Every structure is written in structure tokens, then in C-alpha cells.
């Protein structure tokens, strides 16, 4: 929740469409919670029989 | 004090005065030192409880005593955010005040001797001009020179060096203001302004003074004035939109033709320039050169009565570039300092076709804020928002 | 003193020192009555 | 929660208009319509019924 | 080291006659006042010492 | 059979049938009963 | 050095609103009178209650605040209450109060409306503004509301429930005849409606030794008092304001020698 | 409690005084009325009558905090005048105004007691 | 309002607005989060100006006579707990009301409200330094605890409850009621990122009016537009005004691409405003007209919890710990 390295911190291409882009709080823990989108939906998993 | 405590100037001694609610309550002009602001703030107090230290914080750290700093030896309060717009309106050529404002207005000044000056125009009835009642606030008589933020410097060349067409250079002769609008230039906080010379000619308890007169009454002729932002401050004549759109088709014209003559191998990289580099060099000098035309047709066409260019030229609150972002182009975004990167694979977006380097494709906003912008720009935009919100994050750690 | 049952709403005096639970209804959750000395309002 | 007795910015009384607004809308009317047909004229009196929301039928489902 | 009895106690301590809330602005103060609520004051105290220039007052 | 420029008002009636179906807090009660 | 023959007359009247139009006055003294048709007009209001049994769904502090701002009939018996702190009686007496009571009790299992027509007074001059109904608490079957409340006499800079007006309208100079106001583009601005302009004209010509004259009125009421004893019952009370307060400076300037 | 009672605008205590007198020294014929619990209702009301006297040379008013409830009128007048006479003279000028204006008023209104036309 | 069953739960630190509203321009995602029917906000009449010099650097002046008639009230509750335990055979605890000869350890305070069981019937006035619960403990006579309130609560009791924890432990919880206006130090905040304290707070009589008699309700100063730069805030509530003359609900749904403001515009002009939203405004204490033009519309504002009633605190001579002898709370 210190560390200085910002690449686990800025905002990454791949975040299009699950998680806000916006909505992040500041302080020193920016960038590390983050909420995810409207329609973004988790999977549950299943068995590859 | 307040919660960081920086400079000695963070710590300075006042006077009680007590008031019916409970909040803590302080004049604007001291908000620069203590660096605050009113979105739920908090100060502390303590009190001498001896007589001796008493006496040692009233003749050593008492507010109108810290008026200059030693750091760089230029004051640290002058007029700040509302009195300053107020006060470069009041201070224009055409300022005429009747009689029963003028004495409204001279009801406010604590040093005044109680003597109505002669109007600046007898007949065909008296009427007083704003320079004539700034005269009385400007304490004993001193001298100064000074420009404003908009004096055009081809005019110390020719004729009317002395006569000044657009009302500019400052003259304050024998504490009397001749000529001129103030500004940011010549009442802030810099060297050689007027509070700055106020304070080493006439002392410490005189510009104390001057501050409050002049706060005061600024703000009962502002509340005869008005002033307002709207969203007609924001907005363009229908010639300015077709040059702007005119200006930006041409530009994303001429990347094409970078773009394609660099894949016929026709580049050639300069001394120590890789081809990535010299192609995206030349690719950003045509976007950046292009905006700055953009933002020159804005500005070039706004009106005396805007009032966002009242509080650029003022020098109270903005910049010459918030005016073109809000009226003509946002411009380009950019992480780590380069151009937006391929966070997908050959790609930025799943939107865009691989190995895309069209302006539009790696970050270039071409809408204004008035227009709203489009969702692949408002994702490059959030972009730039955050890595400039994590610097300041880690910056006050770092520094304290 | 009286106290008001949390389902039923049957008023039931319970004594000092003593188990908490209603009647008629066996409960475990109770509500002391209201009280009788009167305060005065402001429409303001 | 319930629909208050003046309007806060003039003074009208308001409070006396929530049940005719809502019969008004019961046949065909439209909210501009409805709103002319009771006399409020000023847009601030008629953010008063454009924008309530009446909470208090909802606190009325659990029994005392 | 911090908090201590070297580093935490000796140089650095909590005080009284002291308080502390929100600022509000205020343009009719003179640059050198402040302005505290009823409240405040009525709780912290000054040591005036008693001599015949002010002993009825 | 196609949709044509009626589309601002058929977008929002294929959302309003997720919602109405997953609801918003999908993402616990369903790792729960797994 | 003296005063103005001001010449009213009023446009139209009814149960509640007056316009009317002040000419040959200055703009000082017509704006002294807007402000007290809001701010110091008198009238009856409910300033103290005390609740017996509230069973409802709202607080007690939330029905004692909707019931202040009920208007009260106030029309011709304001003149005859003391002011409760003036009076020599006791904290309450029928020379300088009137007093209510409210008591409902929900059985059947529709739900009940306790509208206003429920406060039942003693004076039968002062009773609420019912000769629709004001909603006041909705109730479920087995719950209840009973109260007592006085109502006292007060002006506008109490509190906002004592004062007897809607929005007072006021305007002058419906066109720039003085550039009080200056037009950026005076082409885009909607004609007044007090205006005498013609269809393709934007304002009338600039004259420098003008005047304000001529002011315009539109004074509404909320239900106490009838429009046109709101304007009578002002300047009788601005008039009593400046004669108290000569005989304080006569006093003064007597008590000089 | 650290919120004033509504009452204490307008109602006066018992030690203070309504109004008060003082002569300004630093030019002759001024002077400067100090009215207690009062606003910009009297004090507009009064300026702009003592403009309209010829022989006044000076008239304004200010309510030095917006908290407090208090007012202050500054006059001056030519010296064969008084600035306490050029101030009793205002008020019973606006009596004379507001008695008058009540008259024209109350005949307006029963001039459509069933109605003009 | 955070739920509906408001009533039943005993939360700790429980915040209740009295007349929220649903905004007046609406984005098309909140009807499936239920933004109108748990709203939180009003929609008030805003003016963009500077007026006396009490909003600046952050800072609204609002209308003193709408708050009282409602404006932005609320409520506060909150819970104490307290158990009975037999952490010993004689040091068992017990509720009761501690009398002054038998039991010792008690301080000075009045001791009357409590009832026979040892709590306080709902529905006094219980002040600040008020004992709720009388506690005695037996000392190998009776040492009396107790607990007291906080300072500066002047609640109102509102309900107490009697039950059994987790085990076979008695305990009591009790909620005290408290209601806040507001005042000049509260923070409010707009949807756009701008918050900020209130000044001073002016009557009817002296808020600056329009030609029909409509004062604003806040007053916010125009310099916190230019520098940060958001303009969705002067377009809400040009579409706002537009959407209370004529009875619909605004769409704000962000691409839209079928909302201009030239749209918004030619819409205003049609009943009879200026297509901007400016409007000619007279000054409130000398009635003359103010020479600009000020822009003023409804928007949609809200009440944070930060209030002041909770951050003020002062120490003069107060208690001091004991090993070290340094100053320590009470
Ligand atoms: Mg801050
Ligand atoms: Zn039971
Ligand atoms: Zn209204
Ligand atoms: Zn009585």
C-alpha cells in the first residue's frame, strides 16, 4: 500500500469495459481497489470432462 | 497554524475578535501563506498564557510583519481570487460613478481625512472616474512604474509611448494613480509591485491598511457591478467552428502522408535518431503545431463582455489554454510522457485494425469540452487524468 | 416497570431481577414503554 | 418522505396538490399538462411535484 | 526510538489551552484578526495578576 | 426484420433484461452456492 | 428639501394577488416597501406544542414542524394580541394565544388521512385556511396522534413561517431607457411585458438625466391575510417604525444640555 | 447552544440605548448617528431623503458586519445648518410620505367596490 | 435514507434526510439501481455569482428562510450498548439505581431520570454528562459504575431494548435521536466534483431577486469553473430548467449524440427565457438592477456528513495522566 511503482498502479488497456475507469479513491492507496463495470460478469467454473 | 507547517510564515500570530457561530473566521488575502482553502478545512490555535511571551509574539510574529519573505525578498499576500477581477474592471478608462455611489463607496475608507474630491467631469454634471477613487486608497506618496498583462510590445517604438492607446503602463506619480489598469502584474505577489513598495517605503502598520481599504471597498462596488460565468461565455461565432474544422482536416490530412511515405522506406533518420523516432518526432510536431492555430482562432475571436477572458487577463483564476480546450480542441493525451501505447497486442483498442498510428488511433482528442467526447477518447483522457493524479500522491511524501 | 413484547405488542410487568420473556407469545425481546413526564416542542 | 407544505423558494403552499397531480396523470394527462391545470407557473414550484418521490406509502407496509 | 521515552516524549508533545475547527471566510476582518466562536472562548482562560490600576474591573 | 435507427430505444430494452434476470450482486451469491 | 406626491393605481384584484403601479417616487422608498411585505407584516402562527401520544411513522420532531407552517386565518383579530413577551400574564393566556388540539385514532384497516380539517381551535376567528386539505401524517390500523398546541403572534424575521406573502413581484424601467442593466447583444432578450416598445425594436433610446419613476407591483398571499390588507397593513407598520424612532432622538438631543 | 435566538435581531436589551450621538473632529458641521438593532430597511430609507436637501454636502450609511445588528449615518452641512436638525427634518419628510401614499391607496381600492367598469 | 426498515435496525451512526428528491436530469442506468426510490439530494435553485464576498475560495452562501421550511434537514441517530457480567463471584454487576449513602464510587451528577431498573424511559431530553445506565458493582460493599453521554448530545431518548446476547448475558441497547440543521460550517457538494463549506446565510429580504420574485437557494462563486473545467456542470442545469417548464425528466446519458446545446437552446426560447439561461437580477438591499446578467438554474445538490457539530473541541487546564503526568483526554 507504499510502494512506488507505478506499473501496478496506472491504468492498463485491457481494463476496457470491466473495470471503472473513473471511480478509484486517492490518497496512497490509488489504483489499488478498483470496482468493476455494470455488465462485467465472473465465471464460476465447470469440469473439462 | 495550519496542518503542514512549511515556511515560518505557516505560523503567525493574530487578534482575537468574537463572533456568534462556530466556525473559525479569517480574511482571503492570508489564504497564500497559510495555503488554505474553505472545502472543510482546519486550523489550530494556542494562547500565550504569560505576559512575556505575550509581548515577544506581539513585536516578533505578529501577520503584518511577515508581509515579505526572505526566501526570494518579494511579498507573500496580495489581492487574490474575487477582488482581483474586480479591481481591473474598476481601474478601466470608462468607470463613471454618480454622486450618491461615490459617497456610498468613500463611506468605507478608514483613513480617509473627509474630503470629497473635485469630479473628473463638471459639467454637464459631476461624475467621478474609478482612478480618481483608487487615488484615495493608495497610502502617502509613492512611486511606480508598471505594465499590464496585455501591453503590446511594438508600442514603446513608435508615437504614444506616453499616451498609451489601450490604457496600459502603470503610473503611480506622487500616490496618485495617472494611468493605467492593475492587474496581477503590479497588486500580487511579485518583486517590485505596489504592496511591495507601499511596505519599504511607509512601514509595516500602514499596509495593513491598505489591504483591508482596498478589500472593502472593492467588494461594495462589486455588489453594484455583478459577475457571473455562463455557458454564452462558452461558446462561438459559426466562422470560427468551420476554421477550426478546416485547420484539423488538414492536419490529420498531412499525417496520412507521413504515414504512408514511411512505409515505402523514403525516411531517412537523422544524427542519432532511430526511424521510430525520427517518424514519431516529425508525426508529433505536425499535431503539436496544429492545436496551437486551433487555440489562436479561438482567442482571436472572443469578446469584451466574455468572462472567461476576464479572469485570464486579470490574472484572478485560468489560463490562455483552458480557453482553447474548452472552445476549440482538448488536444493529445499521452502516458510516461510518449504517446498512448499498444496495451493490446499491436493494438490500443479492439476497435482499431492492427498496427494503427493514425492521430485518432493512439490518443489525439479533437473535441472540445463543449462538444463532449466520443468513448475512445474518454478512455485515453482517464488515462492521463491518473498517471497525473499518482505523481501528486507520491510528491508531499517525498518532499516533507 | 411495563414492558412491550417485540411480536405481539402485550404489555407485561416484569419484576427486578428476573427472567426476560413474554407471555402467550415466548419472546425474548422487549421494549420499554414510553414514559409519562411531558416535553415541549418548537414549531421552529 | 412526504410531500412538504411550501415551496422552498417562493412560499406557495404545495402541500394541498399531491393528490389532484396524481389524479390528473390517472387519465391521460401529460405532465406539462397537469401541472398547468393547478396554477404553477413558476419553475420553481413545479420541481416541487416534478421531482417527489413518496416514501412514506412504502413505510406503511410494516406493521406497528 | 519513536515513541519511546527518547524520541516521543521529549520534544514532542501533546499540549493545552489549545483548540480547533473549520475556517470560513470572512471580509470584514482586518488582515491581523480572527474570529472565534463563543464557545471557544468562553473555555480558555488568561492569569491576569491583580494591581490597584485594575482590581474593581 | 431488421433494425433500423430504432436502435437508441432496442439497446436499452435488451439491457433492461439482464438486470431484470442477474441482478447486481450476482457476483457473491453465486461463488456461494458453488 | 421635501417629500413626493406618490399617486397609486391598481390594475387588477383578487382573492390572491394585487398589481398595482407607485408613480412619482424614488427607488429607495419603493424598495423599503418591498421588503416589508415579507419581512414586517404580523400574523398568527403555532408556536409550541407538546405531544401526548405518537404512535406514527414519523418522529415527534417532525410533526411539530409540519404544523408551524400551516396559515392561520389572521385577518382582523392580529391587532387585538399582545406580543407573548409584552403581555403581563403568565406564559399563556387567552389575550395572547390561541389554542388547538388534534386527536386521531386509526381502526379500520384502510389507511387514514389526517389532513388539517383535525385541528380544532377555541376562537372561532382563528381556524386554518379550510371555509383543499393540507396533509400533515398518513396512519396504519392500531396506530395514533394526539396533541395541544398555542399559536402566537410574530413578523418575518422570527422565522419564515410568519410571513404572509408568495413571491412579490417588482420590477422598473421595463426598457433601457436608463442602461441600468447593459445588453451585450440586446437581440436575443424576450420583451417585457410591461413594455411599450414596437415588434422590431430591442430598447428605447439612451437618456442621461433620467430618472426611476413608475414601479411595478405584484404582491400574492398565502391564505392568512387578503392581498390588499398586506399593503395596508405594511405602510401602516413602516410609518410607526419612523415615528418611534424621533421620539428616541428627540429624546436624545434634548438630553444634550 | 452556540446559535444566537432569532429575537436578539431586533429586540433590544436592557442596558443599550436605540441611538446615539458623537462629533466627528476631523471637519466641522459632521457628525455620526450610531442606530442600534436596525438594517438596510432604515438606514436606505434615510440616505437617500438627506441627498434630496440642498444644504447637505455629505450622507451615506454602512452596517459594519453583517452578524451584528447595528448601523451607522454619517451627515455634514453647510455651516449655517445643523446636522442634527438636517436629520429630524429627513424623518418627518417620510411621515409626510407614507400617511399620504395610505390615503391614495385606500381610496384605490374602494374604487371597485363592485367595480369601475 | 440508506434502507427502508429504518425503524427495526439499531445501527450505530444512522444519517436520515427528510425530504429527498430524484434528480430532475437523469441518467438512463439508475432506474436498475434504484436512484428513485432511495434517493439522496434536492434539487435546489443555484446562481453562479459573486454577491458579497462570503463565497470565495470554495465556499455557498445560501437562503436562510428555506432552511426553515425544510431545506436540507435531517436527522442523527445513535446506539449504545451495554451488558451485565458476572466476571467474578463477588465483582457481579447488576442494573439498578445507585443511591448515594450505600453505593461510593459515583460522581456528583443527578441520578433522577433512571427508573428502578436503572435505564431511562424513551422520550426525555437527555443533555450532555447525563447518566443513561446505573451499574452497580459489588465490592468484596457496592461500587457503583455507570455510564454517561458523551459531551454536546442534547438527544432525545429514543427507544430502549431488554434481551439476551450470543449466551446467558442480559443486555440493554438504546438510541438517542438528534436534529441537525443546517449551519454555516456544513459541506455541501454538487455531482460534479465541488465541494465546499457554507459563509453566511441571508434572508429572503435580502437575496437577490429576478422580475417574478425567485430567489436562488445557493449562491456559488464563479471562479471555481474556469480553472478545473467542467462544463457538464452549466449544462445540467440549463437542461434542468428546461425540464421543470415543460413537465418531462431530462436524458443525461453520456454519448448520447442526439443532445446539443444548440438544441437545448432553441428549446429554452420557446417559453420565453433567454437561450442561455442568463437572467436580469435586482439587487436585494437597494432594489436597483445589477449591470451584468447572471446565470442561474436548478441543480442537484448534496449534503455530505462532514458537519461541524463533530470537529470542534478545545482543552484548557484538563486532565492529566498519571505515570508520565502528560495531558490525556476524558
Ligand atoms: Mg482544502
Ligand atoms: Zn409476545
Ligand atoms: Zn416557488
Ligand atoms: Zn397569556
Keep these: 500500500r507504499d510502494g512506488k511503482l507505478a506499473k501496478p498502479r496506472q491504468l492498463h488497456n485491457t481494463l476496457w469495459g470491466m473495470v471503472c475507469p473513473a471511480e478509484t479513491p486517492e490518497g496512497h492507496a490509488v489504483g489499488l481497489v478498483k470496482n468493476l463495470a455494470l455488465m462485467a460478469y465472473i465465471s464460476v467454473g465447470s469440469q473439462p470432462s | 497554524n495550519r496542518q503542514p507547517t512549511l515556511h515560518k510564515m505557516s505560523m503567525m500570530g493574530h487578534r482575537v475578535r468574537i463572533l456568534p457561530w462556530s466556525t473559525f473566521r479569517l480574511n482571503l488575502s492570508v489564504t497564500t501563506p497559510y495555503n488554505a482553502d474553505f472545502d472543510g478545512d482546519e486550523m489550530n490555535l494556542h494562547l500565550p498564557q504569560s505576559l512575556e511571551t505575550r509581548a515577544e509574539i506581539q513585536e516578533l510574529a505578529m501577520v503584518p510583519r511577515m508581509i515579505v519573505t526572505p526566501q526570494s525578498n518579494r511579498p507573500v499576500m496580495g489581492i487574490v481570487q474575487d477582488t482581483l477581477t474586480a479591481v481591473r474592471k474598476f481601474t478601466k478608462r470608462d468607470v463613471f460613478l454618480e454622486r450618491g455611489e461615490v459617497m456610498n463607496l468613500l463611506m468605507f475608507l478608514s483613513t480617509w481625512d473627509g474630503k470629497v474630491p473635485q469630479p473628473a467631469i463638471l459639467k454637464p454634471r459631476p461624475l467621478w472616474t474609478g482612478k480618481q477613487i483608487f487615488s484615495l486608497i493608495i497610502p502617502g506618496h509613492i512611486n511606480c512604474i508598471r505594465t499590464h498583462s496585455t501591453h503590446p510590445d511594438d508600442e514603446d517604438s513608435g508615437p504614444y509611448k506616453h499616451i498609451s492607446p489601450g490604457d496600459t503602463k502603470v503610473v503611480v506619480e506622487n500616490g496618485e494613480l495617472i494611468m493605467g489598469i492593475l492587474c496581477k502584474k503590479s497588486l500580487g505577489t511579485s518583486a517590485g509591485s505596489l504592496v511591495h513598495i507601499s511596505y519599504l517605503e511607509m512601514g ?113 483564476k485560468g489560463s490562455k489554454i483552458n480557453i482553447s480546450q474548452v472552445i476549440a480542441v482538448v488536444g493529445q493525451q499521452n502516458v510516461e510522457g510518449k504517446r498512448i501505447p499498444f496495451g493490446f497486442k499491436h493494438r490500443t483498442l479492439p476497435h482499431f485494425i492492427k498496427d494503427d498510428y493514425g492521430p485518432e488511433s493512439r490518443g489525439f482528442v479533437e473535441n472540445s469540452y463543449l462538444a463532449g467526447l466520443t468513448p475512445t477518447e474518454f478512455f485515453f483522457h482517464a488515462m492521463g487524468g491518473r498517471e497525473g493524479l499518482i505523481d501528486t500522491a507520491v510528491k508531499t511524501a517525498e518532499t516533507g | 416497570m411495563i414492558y412491550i413484547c417485540g411480536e405481539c405488542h402485550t404489555e407485561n410487568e416484569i419484576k427486578s431481577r428476573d427472567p426476560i420473556r413474554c407471555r402467550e407469545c415466548g419472546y425474548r425481546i422487549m421494549y420499554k414503554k414510553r414514559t409519562k413526564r411531558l416535553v415541549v416542542f418548537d414549531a421552529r | 418522505m412526504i410531500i412538504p407544505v411550501r415551496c422552498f423558494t417562493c412560499g406557495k403552499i404545495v402541500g394541498n396538490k399531491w393528490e389532484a397531480y396524481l389524479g390528473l396523470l390517472q387519465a391521460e394527462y401529460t405532465e406539462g399538462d397537469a401541472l398547468d391545470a393547478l396554477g404553477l407557473k413558476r419553475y420553481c414550484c413545479r420541481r416541487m411535484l416534478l421531482a417527489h418521490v413518496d416514501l412514506i406509502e412504502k413505510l406503511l407496509n410494516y406493521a406497528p | 526510538g519513536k515513541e519511546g521515552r527518547v524520541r516521543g516524549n521529549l520534544m514532542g508533545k501533546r499540549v493545552d489551552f489549545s483548540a480547533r475547527t473549520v475556517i470560513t471566510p470572512d471580509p470584514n476582518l482586518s488582515i491581523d484578526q480572527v474570529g472565534v466562536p463563543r464557545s471557544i472562548a468562553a473555555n480558555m482562560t488568561f492569569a491576569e495578576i491583580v494591581t490597584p490600576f485594575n482590581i474593581d474591573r | 426484420e431488421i433494425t433500423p435507427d430504432l436502435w437508441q430505444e432496442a439497446c436499452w430494452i435488451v439491457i433492461s433484461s439482464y438486470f431484470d434476470e442477474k441482478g447486481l450482486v450476482r457476483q457473491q451469491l453465486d461463488s456461494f452456492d458453488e | 428639501p421635501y417629500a413626493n406626491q406618490p399617486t397609486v393605481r391598481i390594475t387588477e384584484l383578487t382573492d390572491e394577488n394585487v398589481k398595482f403601479i407607485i408613480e412619482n417616487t424614488d427607488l ?172 422590431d425594436e430591442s430598447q428605447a433610446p439612451y437618456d442621461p438625466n433620467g430618472k426611476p419613476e413608475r414601479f411595478y407591483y405584484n404582491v400574492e398571499s398565502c391564505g392568512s391575510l387578503r392581498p390588499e390588507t398586506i399593503v395596508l397593513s405594511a405602510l401602516s407598520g413602516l410609518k410607526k417604525k419612523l415615528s418611534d424612532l424621533q421620539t428616541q432622538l428627540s429624546h436624545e438631543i434634548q438630553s444634550d444640555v | 447552544m452556540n446559535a444566537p435566538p432569532a429575537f436578539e435581531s431586533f429586540l433590544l436589551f436592557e442596558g443599550e440605548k436605540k441611538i446615539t450621538i458623537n462629533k466627528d473632529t476631523k471637519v466641522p458641521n459632521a457628525c455620526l448617528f450610531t442606530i442600534n438593532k436596525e438594517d438596510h430597511t432604515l438606514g436606505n ?50 411621515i409626510s410620505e407614507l400617511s399620504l401614499l395610505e390615503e391614495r391607496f385606500r381610496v384605490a381600492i374602494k374604487d371597485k367596490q363592485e367595480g369601475i367598469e | 435514507v440508506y434502507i427502508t426498515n429504518f425503524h427495526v435496525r439499531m445501527d450505530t451512526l444512522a444519517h436520515v434526510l427528510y425530504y429527498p428528491q430524484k434528480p430532475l436530469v437523469t441518467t438512463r442506468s439508475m432506474e436498475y439501481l434504484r436512484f428513485r426510490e432511495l434517493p439522496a439530494g434536492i434539487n435546489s435553485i443555484v446562481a453562479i455569482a459573486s454577491y458579497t464576498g462570503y463565497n470565495q475560495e470554495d465556499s455557498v452562501i445560501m437562503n436562510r428562510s428555506a432552511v426553515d421550511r425544510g431545506f436540507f434537514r435531517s436527522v442523527f441517530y445513535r446506539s449504545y450498548k451495554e451488558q451485565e457480567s458476572k466476571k467474578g463471584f463477588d465483582q457481579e454487576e447488576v442494573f439498578e439505581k445507585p443511591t448515594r449513602e450505600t453505593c461510593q464510587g459515583m460522581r456528583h451528577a443527578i441520578y ?27 465490592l468484596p460493599t457496592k461500587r457503583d459504575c455507570s455510564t454517561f453521554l458523551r459531551t454536546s448530545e442534547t438527544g432525545i431518548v429514543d427507544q430502549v431494548m431488554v434481551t439476551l446476547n450470543q449466551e446467558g448475558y442480559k443486555f440493554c441497547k438504546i438510541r438517542v435521536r438528534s436534529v441537525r440543521i443546517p449551519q454555516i460550517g456544513d459541506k455541501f457538494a454538487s455531482r460534479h466534483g465541488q ?49 421543470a417548464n415543460k413537465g418531462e425528466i431530462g436524458d443525461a446519458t453520456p454519448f448520447n449524440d442526439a443532445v446539443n446545446v444548440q438544441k437545448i437552446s432553441n428549446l429554452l426560447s420557446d417559453y420565453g427565457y433567454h437561450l442561455r439561461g442568463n437572467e436580469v437580477l435586482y439587487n436585494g438591499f437597494t432594489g436597483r438592477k445589477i449591470t451584468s446578467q447572471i446565470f442561474i438554474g436548478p441543480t442537484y445538490y448534496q449534503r455530505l456528513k462532514h458537519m461541524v457539530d463533530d470537529k470542534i473541541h478545545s482543552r484548557a487546564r484538563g486532565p492529566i495522566q498519571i505515570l508520565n503526568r502528560q495531558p490525556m483526554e476524558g
Design chain 8, 45 to 94: 430609507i434615510i440616505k437617500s431623503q438627506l441627498l434630496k436637501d440642498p444644504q447637505v454636502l455629505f450622507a451615506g450609511y454602512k452596517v459594519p458586519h453583517p452578524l451584528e445588528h447595528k448601523i451607522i449615518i454619517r451627515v455634514q452641512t453647510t455651516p449655517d445648518y445643523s446636522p442634527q436638525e438636517a436629520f429630524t427634518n429627513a424623518i418627518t419628510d417620510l
Design chain 2, 204 to 316: 509595516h502598520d500602514i499596509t495593513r491598511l491598505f489591504y483591508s481599504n482596498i478589500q472593502t471597498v472593492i467588494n461594495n462596488w462589486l455588489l453594484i457591478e455583478g459577475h457571473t460565468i455562463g455557458i454564452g461565455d462558452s461558446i462561438a461565432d459559426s466562422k470560427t467552428y468551420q476554421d477550426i474544422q478546416n485547420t484539423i482536416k488538414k492536419a490529420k490530412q498531412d499525417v496520412i502522408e507521413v504515414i504512408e511515405k514511411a512505409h515505402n522506406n523514403e525516411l531517412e533518420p537523422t544524427p542519432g535518431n532511430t526511424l521510430r523516432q525520427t517518424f514519431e518526432n516529425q508525426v508529433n510536431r505536425i499535431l503539436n503545431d496544429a492545436r496551437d492555430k486551433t487555440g489562436s482562432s479561438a482567442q482571436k475571436s472572443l469578446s469584451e463582455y466574455n468572462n472567461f477572458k476576464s479572469m485570464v487577463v486579470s490574472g484572478a
Design chain 9, 112 to 138: 433522577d431520570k433512571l427508573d428502578d431498573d436503572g435505564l431511562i424511559a424513551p422520550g426525555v431530553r437527555v443533555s450532555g454528562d447525563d447518566v443513561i445506565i446505573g451499574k452497580t458493582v459489588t
Design chain 7, 28 to 199: 429607495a422608498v419603493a424598495n423599503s416597501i418591498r421588503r416589508v411585505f415579507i419581512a414586517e407584516v404580523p400574523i398568527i402562527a403555532i408556536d409550541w406544542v407538546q405531544i401526548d401520544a405518537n404512535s406514527s411513522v414519523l418522529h415527534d420532531e417532525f410533526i411539530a414542524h409540519r404544523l408551524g407552517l400551516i396559515p392561520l386565518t389572521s385577518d382582523d383579530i392580529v391587532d387585538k394580541l399582545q406580543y407573548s413577551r409584552d403581555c403581563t400574564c403568565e406564559e399563556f393566556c387567552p389575550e395572547c394565544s390561541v389554542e388547538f388540539t388534534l386527536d386521531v385514532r386509526c381502526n379500520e384497516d384502510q389507511t387514514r388521512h389526517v389532513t388539517s380539517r383535525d385541528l380544532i381551535s377555541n376562537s372561532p376567528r382563528v381556524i386554518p385556511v379550510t371555509s383543499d386539505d393540507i396533509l400533515i401524517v398518513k396512519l396504519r390500523k392500531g396506530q395514533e396522534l394526539r396533541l395541544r398546541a398555542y399559536a402566537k403572534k410574530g413578523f418575518g424575521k422570527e422565522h419564515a413561517k410568519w410571513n404572509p406573502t408568495a413571491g412579490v413581484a417588482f420590477e422598473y424601467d421595463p426598457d433601457n431607457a436608463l442602461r441600468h442593466t447593459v445588453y451585450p447583444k440586446p437581440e436575443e432578450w424576450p420583451k417585457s411585458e410591461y413594455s411599450e416598445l414596437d415588434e
Design chain 9, 195 to 243: 465541494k465546499g463549506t457554507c459563509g453566511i446565510q441571508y434572508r429572503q429580504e435580502d437575496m437577490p431577486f429576478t422580475c417574478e420574485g425567485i430567489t436562488p437557494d445557493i449562491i456559488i462563486n464563479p471562479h471555481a469553473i474556469p480553472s478545473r473545467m467542467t462544463i457538464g456542470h452549466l449544462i445540467e442545469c440549463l437542461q434542468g430548467k428546461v425540464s
